[PDB]
Amino acid sequence: MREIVHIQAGQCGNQIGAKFWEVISDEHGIDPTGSYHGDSDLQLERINVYYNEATGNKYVPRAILVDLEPGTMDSVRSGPFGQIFRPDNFVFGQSGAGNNWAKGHYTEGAELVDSVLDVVRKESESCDCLQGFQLTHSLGGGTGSGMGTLLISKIREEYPDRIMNTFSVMPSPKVSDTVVEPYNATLSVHQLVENTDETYCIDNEALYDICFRTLKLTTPTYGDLNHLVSATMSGVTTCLRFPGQLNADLRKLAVNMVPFPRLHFFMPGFAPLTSRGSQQYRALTVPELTQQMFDSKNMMAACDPRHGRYLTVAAIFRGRMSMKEVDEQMLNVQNKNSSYFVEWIPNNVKTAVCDIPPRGLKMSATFIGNSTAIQELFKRISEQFTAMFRRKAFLHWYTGEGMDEMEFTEAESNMNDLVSEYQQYQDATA
Amino acid sequence: MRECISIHVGQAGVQIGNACWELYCLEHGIQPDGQMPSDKTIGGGDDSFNTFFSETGAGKHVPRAVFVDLEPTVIDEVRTGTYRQLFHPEQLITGKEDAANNYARGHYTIGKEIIDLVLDRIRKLADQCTGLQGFLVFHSFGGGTGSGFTSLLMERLSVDYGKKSKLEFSIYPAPQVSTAVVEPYNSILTTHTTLEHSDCAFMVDNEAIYDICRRNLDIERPTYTNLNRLISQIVSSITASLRFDGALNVDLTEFQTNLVPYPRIHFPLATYAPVISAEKAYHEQLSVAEITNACFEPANQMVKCDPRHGKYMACCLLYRGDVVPKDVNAAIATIKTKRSIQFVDWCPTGFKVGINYQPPTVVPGGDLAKVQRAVCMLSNTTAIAEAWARLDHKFDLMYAKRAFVHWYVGEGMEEGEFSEAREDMAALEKDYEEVGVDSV
Numbered sequence: 001m002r003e004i005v006h007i008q009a010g011q012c013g014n015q016i017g018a019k020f021w022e023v024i025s026d027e028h029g030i031d032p033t034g035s036y037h038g039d040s041d042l043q044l045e046r047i048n049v050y051y052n053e054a055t056g057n058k059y060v061p062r063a064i065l066v067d068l069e070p071g072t073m074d075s076v077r078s079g080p081f082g083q084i085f086r087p088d089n090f091v092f093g094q095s096g097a098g099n100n101w102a103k104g105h106y107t108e109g110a111e112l113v114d115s116v117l118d119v120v121r122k123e124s125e126s127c128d129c130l131q132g133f134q135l136t137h138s139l140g141g142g143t144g145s146g147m148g149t150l151l152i153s154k155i156r157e158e159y160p161d162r163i164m165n166t167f168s169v170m171p172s173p174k175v176s177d178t179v180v181e182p183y184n185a186t187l188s189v190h191q192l193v194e195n196t197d198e199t200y201c202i203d204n205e206a207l208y209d210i211c212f213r214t215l216k217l218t219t220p221t222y223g224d225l226n227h228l229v230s231a232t233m234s235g236v237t238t239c240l241r242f243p244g245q246l247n248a249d250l251r252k253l254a255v256n257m258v259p260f261p262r263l264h265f266f267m268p269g270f271a272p273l274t275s276r277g278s279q280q281y282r283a284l285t286v287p288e289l290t291q292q293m294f295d296s297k298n299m300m301a302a303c304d305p306r307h308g309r310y311l312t313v314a315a316i317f318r319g320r321m322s323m324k325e326v327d328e329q330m331l332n333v334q335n336k337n338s339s340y341f342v343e344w345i346p347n348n349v350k351t352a353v354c355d356i357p358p359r360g361l362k363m364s365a366t367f368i369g370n371s372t373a374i375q376e377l378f379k380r381i382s383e384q385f386t387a388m389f390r391r392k393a394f395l396h397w398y399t400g401e402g403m404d405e406m407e408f409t410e411a412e413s414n415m416n417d418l419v420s421e422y423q424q425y426q427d428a429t430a
Numbered sequence: 431m432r433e434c435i436s437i438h439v440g441q442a443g444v445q446i447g448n449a450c451w452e453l454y455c456l457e458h459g460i461q462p463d464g465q466m467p468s469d470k471t472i473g474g475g476d477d478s479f480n481t482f483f484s485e486t487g488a489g490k491h492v493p494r495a496v497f498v499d500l501e502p503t504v505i506d507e508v509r510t511g512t513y514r515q516l517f518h519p520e521q522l523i524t525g526k527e528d529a530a531n532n533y534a535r536g537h538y539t540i541g542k543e544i545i546d547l548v549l550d551r552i553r554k555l556a557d558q559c560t561g562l563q564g565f566l567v568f569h570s571f572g573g574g575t576g577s578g579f580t581s582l583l584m585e586r587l588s589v590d591y592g593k594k595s596k597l598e599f600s601i602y603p604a605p606q607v608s609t610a611v612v613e614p615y616n617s618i619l620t621t622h623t624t625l626e627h628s629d630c631a632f633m634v635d636n637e638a639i640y641d642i643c644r645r646n647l648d649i650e651r652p653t654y655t656n657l658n659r660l661i662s663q664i665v666s667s668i669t670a671s672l673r674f675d676g677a678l679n680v681d682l683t684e685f686q687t688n689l690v691p692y693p694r695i696h697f698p699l700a701t702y703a704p705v706i707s708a709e710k711a712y713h714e715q716l717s718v719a720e721i722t723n724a725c726f727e728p729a730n731q732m733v734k735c736d737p738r739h740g741k742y743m744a745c746c747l748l749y750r751g752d753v754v755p756k757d758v759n760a761a762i763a764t765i766k767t768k769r770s771i772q773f774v775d776w777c778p779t780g781f782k783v784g785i786n787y788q789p790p791t792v793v794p795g796g797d798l799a800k801v802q803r804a805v806c807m808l809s810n811t812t813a814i815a816e817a818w819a820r821l822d823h824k825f826d827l828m829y830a831k832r833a834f835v836h837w838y839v840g841e842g843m844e845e846g847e848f849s850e851a852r853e854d855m856a857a858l859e860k861d862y863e864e865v866g867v868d869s870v
């Protein structure tokens with residue numbers, strides 16, 4: 001009974017957050033009404049990590065839904081799994097954040113944040129032994145990015161010894177034409193470097209390219225993008241949710257994955273890559289899972305892992321398979337590409353196997369990499385940031401909310417420092 | 431929530447308001463007595479059309495609008511016309527003596543006598559709103575009321591509503607339909623006075639509209655009625671994101687974020703397609719690709735200027751009707767190949783796109799064909815400054831001899847206000863030059 005409290009903020013945050021709860025509710029045999037109807041005891045053994053129990057043996061997600069406008073949450077409450085959420089855990093404003101980090105962090109979000117913290121507190125108080133928090137949000141908008149990071153900082157102040165974990169969706173001009181997203185994202189990364197323990201870098205650039213190139217979807221939708229995100233979120237939380245040895249709680253994961261406190265940005269990967277309703281009939285072999293899960297084309301961050309080195313890796317295999325073959329194949333990846341794993345962290349790849357496959361697959365594998373190649377992502381954002389900032393373009397939207405240019409300069413400098421620190425360990429020898 | 435209050439000032443503002451509100455009624459299925467059978471919530475609601483229409487207990491849908499003019503004869507036609515039941519009498523405000531094409535009379539001598547009453551009536555509208563978003567202000571550059579009273583009103587609105595957003599639709603003068611020699615003076619005076627009070631201003635060049643009516647609709651000698659029906663389609667395109675919702679709809683405020691990189695650089699160029707007669711549209715399917723391509727033809731612009739001789743800082747496409755994502759994406763791809771659209775080096779080049787599924791509407795007796803799909807492009811281009819340069823030149827010719835200046839001085843203005851206004855315009859032209867220069 002090591003509870004996690006889940007928060008989802010802004011449009012993107014609530015969209016992928018709601019999909020996460022649909023996907024893992026089905027895995028745990030919980031229906032849209034909160035009733036359990038599964039066939040395995042494995043489903044319920046750690047159900048309390050993400051669910052509260054009610055009377056009638058109802059299971060309620062330990063989830064808080066936040067937004068500065070009502071639209072997406074109205075959508076969620078009218079979705080399939082809308083009823084499953086605790087009605088008092090819907091916390092929303094009317095003003096919106098207008099894709100503006102300053103509105104989310106300093107003005108509009110500040111008016112709403114105490115209400116949110118009140119709900120967070122009610123959930124935390126109910127916990128036998130709270131582990132920490134997970135937040136879903138995008139970095140490119142205003143609410144998830146600005147108010148999301150505001151929340152992270154306030155939660156850290158009230159719960160300074162708990163783990164803070166985020167699923168953070170990075171903007172890409174391949175998916176959004178909103179010009180200020182690199183500003184919002186850079187301001188947010190500055191916050192994440194300081195205040196989270198673990199951040200999964202979910203890159204819309206990678207998501208779009210997987211859909212277009214690999215899944216051959218000529219007009220990718222957010223539904224298609226979020227299908228990849230919810231598969232990934234299911235895979236990377238598997239060790240938290242089912243009986244197991246490795247990375248079985250947020251703190252043990254962090255101690256295995258984070259060798260230096262600022263370098264806590266992870267590149268997730270998944271195999272097999274599927275589109276919604278592709279419904280494929282051949283299971284992958286263990287060698288296939290292993291090859292594909294490490295492939296650049298299967299990464300959810302648009303970074304070439306061959307351009308960097310792995311500091312640490314977690315791999316999670318799901319389904320009925322030979323654990324002997326899993327061990328053999330995992331050893332083969334490392335022994336065949338040993339130069340890509342830093343030699344000064346011995347045995348830095350850990351493997352978990354869970355018997356329960358995700359819905360629709362017999363076999364799957366999820367990859368979590370702490371790779372120095374993630375610098376490519378931050379460099380991409382930094383270049384977009386500087387192209388505008390050198391001319392102070394669009395800054396009036398932010399200074400109108402009380403921000404000074406100095407705050408932008410500090411955020412930029414901190415992210416460029418982060419990039420340089422990755423490069424440092426990339427070039428480091430034993 | 432998210433209410434928008436429209437303010438129609440002077441003859442041009444009022445007559446364009448007539449055309450816009452008639453068109454909105456047809457778009458939403460509101461009858462001229464204000465009833466809307468399709469609306470099942472009586473006496474209120476938070477539907478998308480409610481941003482522009484309030485409701486009475488008796489089922490009336492009432493424009494969130496004030497009409498104001500310094501003489502009565504234009505608003506009197508509203509009071510006795512087809513849509514007279516649509517407006518509460520207190521929404522229609524008139525004085526007795528107009529500004530006589532003199533900014534100074536509109537802003538000072540005559541305008542000062544009615545400004546408090548106008549603000550009182552705007553306040554009554556504002557009080558009805560649960561989340562007022564801002565104002566939309568319609569006026570000519572050239573008229574004494576459209577120039578001088580609008581400036582006075584905008585200044586007073588900044589004081590009374592702070593930084594609540596104010597957008598303009600501003601009618602830029604053309605010699606084919608102009609009525610005063612001093613329109614360049616009035617234009618420069620009001621642009622200077624209103625510049626720090628407006629968040630976004632859509633200029634409508636009467637010569638561009640006049641040309642489009644002649645060339646595309648084969649109208650021999652366009653009237654204000656011809657011009658205003660076209661203008662209202664363009665205005666409707668721009669406000670559609672506020673009045674309708676759909677999964678692919680993108681709010682006007684989101685376009686505005688992209689369109690305004692610095693507070694003073696807030697004058698988008700609008701381009702609208704298709705503008706075609708019934709005769710020519712018959713048996714002719716104008717595809718998404720075709721109407722999108724037409725956005726980059728200067729012939730279809732609302733302001734005469736040449737964006738091919740300038741640089742872009744933003745490009746937004748506002749679609750309505752039978753328009754699906756795959757076709758828009760393919761059309762933009764094609765355009766980016768074939769047209770050289772040059773952006774400044776400090777802006778991204780991706781076009782921001784909104785789609786509203788409700789198709790365009792036409793008013794009975796018009797010259798526009800009813801079409802399945804239409805688009806309005808809003809671009810931020812350095813070329814818009816051409817329009818300032820033309821007006822500034824006309825101002826300079828007259829001001830050098832102080833021609834007509836005594837009409838303004840006699841109403842209490844000083845020559846210093848003229849030179850201050852012209853210097854602000856010189857600085858604006860220089861601002862548009864500077865944003866076009868490459869970064870170091």
Ligand SMILES: CC[C@H](C)[C@@H]([C@@H](CC(=O)N1CCC[C@H]1[C@H](OC)[C@@H](C)C(=O)N[C@H](C)[C@@H](O)c1ccccc1)OC)N(C)C(=O)[C@@H](NC(=O)[C@@H](NC)C(C)C)C(C)C
Nearest residue numbers: 015174175176219220221222223677678755758759781783
């Ligand atoms: C590549 C950028 C996104 C992904 C696509 C997508 C948006 C979408 O999926 N949208 C707009 C909310 C509705 C949603 C989809 O309908 C189309 C529904 C079916 C959905 O996927 N709904 C999912 C299941 C739902 O959970 C959901 C998720 C997020 C938001 C709302 C609802 O439509 C193709 N967009 C904007 C586009 O393709 C647009 N094109 C562009 O923006 C191009 N630039 C002009 C580039 C960036 C691709 C066209 C519409 C002009």
Ligand SMILES: Nc1nc2c(ncn2[C@@H]2O[C@H](COP(=O)(O)OP(=O)(O)OP(=O)(O)O)[C@@H](O)[C@H]2O)c(=O)[nH]1
Nearest residue numbers: 440441442445528529531570572573574575576607
């Ligand atoms: N497009 C359009 N332009 C108009 C219309 N009415 C007047 N204009 C233009 O507006 C300018 C004249 O200003 P008006 O709006 O008539 O003047 P006013 O605001 O009523 O001011 P005064 O009469 O001086 O008090 C000229 O450029 C006219 O061409 C109209 O209905 N449609």
Ligand SMILES: Nc1nc2c(ncn2[C@@H]2O[C@H](COP(=O)(O)OP(=O)(O)O)[C@@H](O)[C@H]2O)c(=O)[nH]1
Nearest residue numbers: 010011012015138140141142143144171176222
């Ligand atoms: N992958 C994904 N990205 C999204 C979704 N919704 C919005 N985004 C992205 O999130 C960013 C905009 O932030 P958004 O969450 O809409 O703004 P907020 O409501 O102010 O937090 C852009 O980069 C969008 O492309 C979604 O459902 N899935």
Ligand SMILES: [Ca+2]
Nearest residue numbers: 469471474475
């Ligand atoms: Ca109603």
Ligand SMILES: [Mg+2]
Nearest residue numbers: 011012099141
């Ligand atoms: Mg959004």
Ligand SMILES: [Mg+2]
Nearest residue numbers: 440441528575
């Ligand atoms: Mg008049």
